[PDB]
Amino acid sequence: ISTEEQLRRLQEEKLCKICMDRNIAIVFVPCGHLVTCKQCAEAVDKCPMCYTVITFKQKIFM
Amino acid sequence: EISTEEQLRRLQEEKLCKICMDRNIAIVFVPCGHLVTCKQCAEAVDKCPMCYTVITFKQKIFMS
Ligand SMILES: [Ca+2]
Ligand SMILES: [Zn+2]
Ligand SMILES: [Zn+2]
Ligand SMILES: [Zn+2]
Ligand SMILES: [Zn+2]
């Protein structure tokens, strides 16, 4: 696999799993999944990946 | 940043614990939100090593 396709794959992994436009920017407490950008996190009350009820949406920074 | 190779390396390296660079970040610090450490390197800190905010919780995260 090429450098370019590796890079594209890693860039797509960072994308919000709901809008696929912005990068992920929120961690859900308590399940710990990184799924959404800040805006798309407003729409979810359960984690889309594990359906755990979200008790806090922590903004993240790399 | 400056080439496709350096961009690739950056995205691979940003997954790794900033202290040991030997395994993935696995903790987000509450309240500051920094992704800094693997589980092991998080055991020792009570303030965030990047911003020195007091950590009230160490939340386990899934990063692959
Ligand atoms: Ca090493
Ligand atoms: Zn989004
Ligand atoms: Zn989850
Ligand atoms: Zn570490
Ligand atoms: Zn911090």
From Swiss-Prot, chain A:
Domain of life: Eukaryota
Tissue-wise expression: Expressed in colonic crypts (at protein level). Ubiquitous, except peripheral blood leukocytes.
Zn finger limits (RING-type): 16-51
Cellular compartments annotated: Cytoplasm; Nucleus
Effect listed in the UniProt record for changing residue 61 to A: Abolished E3 ubiquitin-protein ligase activity and ability to ubiquitinate RIPK2
Region (Required for ubiquitination and subsequent degradation of BCL2 during apoptosis): 16-62
Result of changing residue 48 to R: In XLP2; uncertain significance
Post-translational modification: S-Nitrosylation down-regulates its E3 ubiquitin-protein ligase activity.
Modified residues (S-nitrosocysteine): 16
Subunit structure: Monomer, and homodimer. Part of a complex composed of SEPTIN4 isoform ARTS, XIAP and BCL2, within the complex interacts with SEPTIN4 isoform ARTS and BCL2, SEPTIN4 isoform ARTS acts as a scaffold protein and stabilizes the complex. Interacts (via BIR3 domain) with DIABLO/SMAC; the interaction inhibits apoptotic suppressor activity. Interacts with HTRA2/PRSS25; the interaction inhibits apoptotic suppressor activity. Interacts with TAB1/MAP3K7IP1 and AIFM1. Interaction with DIABLO/SMAC hinders binding of TAB1/MAP3K7IP1 and AIFM1. Interacts with TCF25 and COMMD1.
Job of this protein: Multi-functional protein which regulates not only caspases and apoptosis, but also modulates inflammatory signaling and immunity, copper homeostasis, mitogenic kinase signaling, cell proliferation, as well as cell invasion and metastasis. Acts as a direct caspase inhibitor. Directly bind to the active site pocket of CASP3 and CASP7 and obstructs substrate entry. Inactivates CASP9 by keeping it in a monomeric, inactive state.
Disease implicated: Lymphoproliferative syndrome, X-linked, 2: A rare immunodeficiency characterized by extreme susceptibility to infection with Epstein-Barr virus (EBV). Symptoms include severe or fatal mononucleosis, acquired hypogammaglobulinemia, pancytopenia and malignant lymphoma.
Domain free text: The first BIR domain is involved in interaction with TAB1/MAP3K7IP1 and is important for dimerization. The second BIR domain is sufficient to inhibit CASP3 and CASP7, while the third BIR is involved in CASP9 inhibition. The interactions with DIABLO/SMAC and HTRA2/PRSS25 are mediated by the second and third BIR domains.
Family note: Belongs to the IAP family.
Name by which UniProt lists this protein: E3 ubiquitin-protein ligase XIAP
Organism: Homo sapiens
Taxonomic lineage: Eukaryota, Metazoa, Chordata, Craniata, Vertebrata
Gene name as annotated: XIAP
